[PDB]
Ligand binder design. Structure first.
Ligand SMILES: Nc1nc2c(ncn2[C@@H]2O[C@H](COP(=O)(O)OP(=O)(O)OP(=O)(O)O)[C@@H](O)[C@H]2O)c(=O)[nH]1
Ligand SMILES: [Mg+2]
Lengths: 49, 14, 23, 360, 46, 87, 87, 103, 368, 51, 78
């Protein structure tokens, strides 16, 4: 941090699943999706082999 | 697109 | 007759100006 | 609320100075005692051009058409196009835009579409070579009238791209206490949809009148071939006299019509130019309006410009009366202190103008 | 219709902006790095 | 007086936009609106702006058939044919 | 300050008409003279110049009569106690 | 660089790169300044986009050299100077709110 | 003689020229061509017309100033009244008509009576675009469409600003508060000053509520003036999947009708996982349900999003303070802040229950 | 519902009252620490660095 | 001392602006006495005008313009 304020590089908090849509648990976000997608891709790669 | 950001207009009462 | 007046139209110069050892 | 004018004289200058000053005006009795009374189509389309250029200005034409209410607004510019009517050429609409042109948010890039020339109006070469240098030394530096195609009357069909792109704050204060020495005299002879020999006939007539003065005469020649020629036959001639040490210029133009001899038109425009040189001092009789308009909307200082005796006329002093009627300023004509000629030096203290539309 | 018009005007705007920014970047590069290298060249003589 | 007239009208519109300020928002002035957070088919009257993925399929009108046909005519009168050539 | 004609008011009066106040009855927007020195750029002398009196509203001037200086400066040297004036 | 001095005073013409769509890009934090001594127009940086809204126009800036310690990534090499004051007030102090810029 | 003739404006202009010895027509009046031919057959009449940096700028401006003085040295009622008029240090009386009653009635000489001359710009109203900043010692953040009293030029006036951002210079879209420690843009309906003029802004100007804190709240300069601004607030349309396949899904409720989906066909949507997508066609029997295609298989626990933009308007509200027309001249009260209105009429502050953040804990992610 | 409404409204007005009665004894709007010492926008620093 | 001379001669340079204040009869410079309620001001304006004009100006009000120099006069207000 050379010219950055610590009140500027704050922590944005992430949002939860809506309580009306709560039976489908855990609204998944981009880290969860990439954990899903690269698993699918490595298993499709070994299936293709 | 011509109307979009205008604010005037001639008022032709003829 | 003035065919040279069309031969000296905006071709290059007026076209650009009329808009402003071994061995 | 409204500054009131009468009659349909100086109509473009009234609407232009109302746009500069920001003062609501009324123009009453637009030819009311007439058989077809009211505003004409070319000045109605000029009002449409004002609504294109500005933003938030409300224009309010009456039922009878004989009185107009202009409550001005911010000059914003932008890119546009204007399909002006056949009653007036593109010079009638690009002449009053040269006042409003350097004082807008976005730069003027307009292309007018219609007839190029007229007997009683400004041409492309008139606007360019005469009226652009006086703005060029009043403070703007990037202004250009381009011809993409030109159309002689009556059918026309010529487009003209007016682009000004120096948005100055205010024009500088003029100080021309001299008569500028004419260094050269050049010109342009144009012809569309006719034979290319008429241009050389015009050039030879103008230069055989001009040959006895001991300066240098140079007239450039353009015939217009193809789609760039427009929809009608026409030809014309525009001479300028060029003071090169300061940049001043004095012009005169005309156009020929059905039955006109080109040597006659060339010598007529040459003699009309020499008479403009005679009746001129540091401006022309037609460059004088926007010269003193930029002097009156300069800074809050004194700017002085030399004029001669014969440039004073009913047009010039009705201009001065309209200037004082809108924003309450006077010109002071002091005479020079040497007496081989009658030249005043008009000193105008400019109002405190800035352009407040350009974003900082 | 609005789809085609909005897409092509956005493409035109982006292609204009990239040209404008690249122009000002390498004009600041050329006609001021020439002076930087001229000052370095006449500082190496000292 | 005239200042009393102006002050009455100023405080009238002050009262108006203060209960406007403490009032609820419109549907369009919140992010995250479902179909039932807003009136029925209110987006036909509303003219929203959104980005779109690909250009639509071109409509084939008489102008584009005319342009394509005179392209074909230029090629076919200059014999600009991109055929295969027999080895 | 140096593109604006301003003025601090050291003297104030209403040159209204008291029998006009007796006619209409104290609701009258009444005329006012404001005396003082002015600073900044030259304020123009024509009537109708717009002016903000900072705290009462916007007006336009009606007539200006400039007055001789009530507290003038006189024409190494020292300042005479005769010429140490006060207004 | 400036001749015989270490700093130079200058006049802010216009914030170059004000239409750059990338925050804290070197094109964006980049100001054009007319030096008052010899009249010539140079180009100077500013510490960030956040302190870019302390200069506006004809601001009586003060500018020193830059001193790049290594070939940067998003650089534009060919801008030599950095803005170190504005209207006689250090804009690092302005950026951390220790002073207020007077006009 | 000639200037008095020009500005004596009850006589015709040709009468001015007559007793000294029309602009739609651009080219001026010339003689007949025959008269001009016999006049300019000769040529000899006009043959004599034919043939450091800082100190430099200061020298130019002092040259202009000495030109000003030596050309002012002229007629006395010309200089001292009408060609410049009342330079500085002139003691004047100045008469205003239609001054309010309350000024003369409540004139207390402690409070100064300042007057300033408005320019041609500053009598115009409209949207002023500023860039402003919460003042570093003002405690509370500022809110859009809460009034604050600006001191913009000579005028002090309470207005309703709306703070915007040009998010990487694409929009000018609408914030809901000012930032904590930097500048934002703003736009308020008020009297159009010139650009580059600075201003302060104050929440509270009275003394009954003057509290213990710092009273000046906002600082800024004016960037631009205009008659209209085009600013937007983002609205997203959220809808949920109910039938998912590979690479395509059927999306339930962001629309109420197939006409609405037809209006929005081809638009790019995305899930909250950032999976991009596009809406393709409205389904027939369930009305607002449509078919979208995505980058890959989305889940049943996702929400799709159509980021759109709704235009928002500045509120044309303007009251100048007029503190000198009061009997107290402090204690000026204008529009209240929104927290003050809620505290007055005891409405609780609006709380969306699913807008509040939580402490999300990840379960470990294992696959088959 | 109205009991919870007046409960949260009473908590708001109680907090606002106990905050707004922080007034000094006389009419003297004393300056405070952030205007007095002027330590504008510093990073978090170390107690071990304070000695 | 040449580097000192350059770095000192540099800080004479400022933005060249116009003046618009006359040199013949300039206005009285506006002096504003600004204080929180309860310190100086009145006592101070009274003391300054008593020293300047030899006149006990008890019970001030409004702007007060006095001559305090051979060419500098100035206006006191509170
Ligand atoms: N001890 C002491 N008292 C002072 C001093 N200066 C002023 N005072 C007192 O301040 C008291 C309040 O009156 P002023 O000083 O005229 O008040 P002010 O500063 O004009 O402020 P306002 O009451 O708001 O008009 C006076 O009665 C003085 O005795 C000082 O230097 N020392
Ligand atoms: Mg006191």
């Amino acid at each position: 941090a050379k010219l950055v304020h610590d009140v500027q590089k704050k922590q944005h908090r992430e949002r939860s699943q809506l309580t009306s849509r709560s039976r489908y648990g855990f609204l998944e976000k981009h880290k969860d999706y990439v954990k899903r997608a690269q698993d699918f891709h490595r298993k499709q790669s070994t299936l293709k082999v | 697109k011509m109307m979009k950001n205008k604010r005037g207009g001639v008022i032709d009462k003829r | 007759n003035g065919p040279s007046d069309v031969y000296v139209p905006p071709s290059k110069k007026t076209q650009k100006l009329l808009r402003s050892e071994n061995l | 609320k409204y500054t009131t004018f009468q009659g349909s004289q100086n109509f473009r200058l009234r609407i232009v100075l109302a746009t500069l000053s920001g003062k609501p005006i009324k123009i009453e009795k637009i030819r009311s005692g007439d058989l077809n009374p009211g505003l004409k189509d070319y000045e109605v389309s000029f009002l449409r051009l004002i609504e294109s250029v500005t933003n938030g200005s409300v224009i309010e034409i009456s039922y009878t058409g004989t009185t107009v209410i202009y409550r001005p607004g911010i000059i914003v510019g932008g890119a546009s196009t204007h399909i002006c009517p056949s009653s007036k050429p593109v010079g009638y609409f690009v002449e009053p835009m040269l006042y409003l042109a350097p004082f807008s948010k976005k730069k003027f890039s307009i292309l007018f579409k219609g007839i190029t020339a007229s007997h009683n109006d400004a041409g492309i070469e008139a606007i360019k070579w005469g009226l652009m240098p006086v703005m060029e030394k009043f403070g703007v530096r990037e202004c250009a009238l381009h011809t993409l195609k030109r159309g002689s009357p009556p059918l026309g069909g010529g487009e003209v791209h007016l682009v000004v792109d120096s948005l100055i704050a205010q024009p500088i204060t003029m100080h021309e206490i001299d008569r500028p020495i004419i260094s050269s005299i050049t010109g342009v002879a144009y012809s569309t949809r006719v034979s290319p020999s008429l241009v050389n006939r015009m050039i030879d007539g103008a230069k055989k009148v001009l040959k006895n003065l001991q300066c240098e005469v140079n007239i450039t020649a353009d015939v217009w071939r193809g789609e760039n020629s427009g929809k009608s036959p026409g030809w014309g001639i525009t001479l300028v006299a060029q003071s090169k040490q300061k940049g001043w210029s004095y012009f005169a133009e005309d156009i020929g019509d059905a039955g006109s001899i080109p040597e006659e038109l060339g010598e007529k425009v040459a003699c009309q130019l020499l008479e403009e040189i005679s009746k001129s001092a540091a401006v022309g009789r037609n460059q004088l309006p926007l010269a003193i308009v930029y002097m009156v909307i300069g800074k809050e200082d004194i700017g002085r410009l030399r004029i001669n005796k014969e440039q004073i006329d009913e047009r010039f002093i009705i201009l001065l009366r309209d200037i004082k009627k809108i924003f309450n300023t006077e010109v002071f004509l002091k005479p020079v202190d040497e007496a081989d000629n009658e030249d005043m030096i008009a000193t105008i203290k400019g109002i405190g103008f800035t352009n407040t539309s350009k974003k900082i | 219709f609005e789809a085609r018009q909005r897409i092509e005007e956005k493409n035109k705007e982006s292609s204009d902006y990239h040209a404008k920014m690249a122009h000002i970047v390498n004009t600041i590069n050329t006609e001021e790095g020439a002076e930087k290298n001229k000052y370095e060249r006449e500082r190496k003589l000292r | 007086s005239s200042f009393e007239k102006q002050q009455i009208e100023i405080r009238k519109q002050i009262e108006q936009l203060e209960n406007e300020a403490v009032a609820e928002k419109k549907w369009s002035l919140k992010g995250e609106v479902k179909a039932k957070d807003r009136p029925e088919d209110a987006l036909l009257t509303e003219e929203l702006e959104f980005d779109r993925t690909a250009k639509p399929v071109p409509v084939i009108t008489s102008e584009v058939t005319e342009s394509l046909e005179d392209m074909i005519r230029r090629r076919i009168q200059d014999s600009n044919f991109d055929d295969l050539q027999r080895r | 300050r140096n593109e604006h004609p301003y003025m601090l008011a050291d003297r104030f009066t209403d040159l209204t008409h008291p029998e006009l106040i007796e006619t209409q009855g104290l609701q009258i927007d009444r005329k006012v003279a404001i005396y003082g020195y002015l600073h900044g750029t030259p304020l123009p002398s024509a009537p109708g110049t717009r002016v903000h009196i900072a705290g009462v509203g916007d007006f336009s001037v009606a007539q200006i009569e400039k007055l001789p200086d009530p507290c003038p400066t006189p024409f190494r040297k020292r300042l005479d106690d005769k010429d140490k004036l006060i207004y | 660089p400036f001749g015989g001095s270490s700093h130079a005073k200058g006049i802010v013409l216009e914030k170059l790169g004000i239409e750059s769509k990338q925050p804290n890009s070197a094109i964006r934090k980049c100001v054009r300044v007319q030096l008052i001594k010899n009249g010539k127009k140079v180009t100077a940086f500013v510490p960030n986009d956040g302190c870019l809204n302390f200069v506006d126009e004809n601001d009586e800036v003060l500018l020193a050299g830059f001193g790049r310690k290594g070939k940067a990534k998003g650089d534009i090499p060919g801008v030599r100077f950095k803005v170190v004051k504005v209207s006689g007030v250090s804009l690092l102090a302005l950026w951390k709110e220790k002073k207020e810029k007077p006009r | 003689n000639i200037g008095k003739l020009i500005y004596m404006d009850n006589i015709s202009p040709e009468e001015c020229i007559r007793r000294w010895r029309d602009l739609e027509k651009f080219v001026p009046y010339f003689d007949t061509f025959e008269k001009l031919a016999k006049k300019w057959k000769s040529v000899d009449a006009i043959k004599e017309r034919f043939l450091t940096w800082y100190e430099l700028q200061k020298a130019k401006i002092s040259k202009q100033l000495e030109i000003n003085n030596i050309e002012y040295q002229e007629m006395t009622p010309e200089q001292r009244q009408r060609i410049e008029g009342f330079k500085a240090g002139s003691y004047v009386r100045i008469v205003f008509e239609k001054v309010p009653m309350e000024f003369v009635k409540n004139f207390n000489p402690k409070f100064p009576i300042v007057m300033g001359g408005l320019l041609p710009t500053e009598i115009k109203f409209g949207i002023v675009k500023a860039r402003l900043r919460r003042h570093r010692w003002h405690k509370k953040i500022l809110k859009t469409n809460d009034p604050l009293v600006l001191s913009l030029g000579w005028r002090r006036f309470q207005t309703l600003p709306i703070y915007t951002t040009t998010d990487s210079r694409t929009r000018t879209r609408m914030l809901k508060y000012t930032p904590e420690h930097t500048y934002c843009n703003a736009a308020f309906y008020g009297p159009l000053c010139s650009p580059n003029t600075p201003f302060c802004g104050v929440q509270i100007v009275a003394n009954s509520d003057t509290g213990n804190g710092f009273r000046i709240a906002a600082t800024g300069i004016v960037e631009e003036i205009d008659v209209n601004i085009e600013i937007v607030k983002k609205l997203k349309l959220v809808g949920f999947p109910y039938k998912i396949f590979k690479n395509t899904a059927f999306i339930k409720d962001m629309f109420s009708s197939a006409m609405e989906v037809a209006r929005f066909e081809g638009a790019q949507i995305k899930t909250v996982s950032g999976i991009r997508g596009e809406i393709k066609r409205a389904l027939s029997k369930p009305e607002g349900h449509y078919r979208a295609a995505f980058e890959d298989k989305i889940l049943m626990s996702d929400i799709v999003i159509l980021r759109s933009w709704y235009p928002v308007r500045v509120k044309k509200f303007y009251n100048p303070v007029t503190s000198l027309l009061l009997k107290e001249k402090t204690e000026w009260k204008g529009l209240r802040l929104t927290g003050q209105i809620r505290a007055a009429m005891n409405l609780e502050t609006p709380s969306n229950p699913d807008s509040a953040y939580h402490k999300i804990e990840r379960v470990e992610r294992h696959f088959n | 519902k109205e009991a919870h409404k007046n409960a949260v409204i009473a908590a708001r007005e109680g907090k606002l009252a106990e905050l707004a009665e922080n007034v000094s004894g006389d009419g003297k709007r004393a300056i405070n620490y952030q205007i007095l010492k002027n330590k504008g926008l510093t990073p978090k620093r170390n107690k071990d660095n304070r000695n | 001392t040449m580097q000192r001379s350059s770095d000192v001669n540099e800080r004479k340079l400022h933005v060249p602006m116009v003046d618009r204040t006359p040199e013949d009869d300039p206005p009285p410079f506006i002096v504003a006495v600004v204080g929180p309620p309860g310190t100086g001001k009145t006592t101070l304006i009274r003391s300054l005008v008593r020293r300047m004009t030899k006149s006990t100006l008890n019970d001030i009000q409004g702007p007060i313009t006095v001559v305090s120099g051979k060419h500098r006069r100035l206006t006191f207000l509170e």
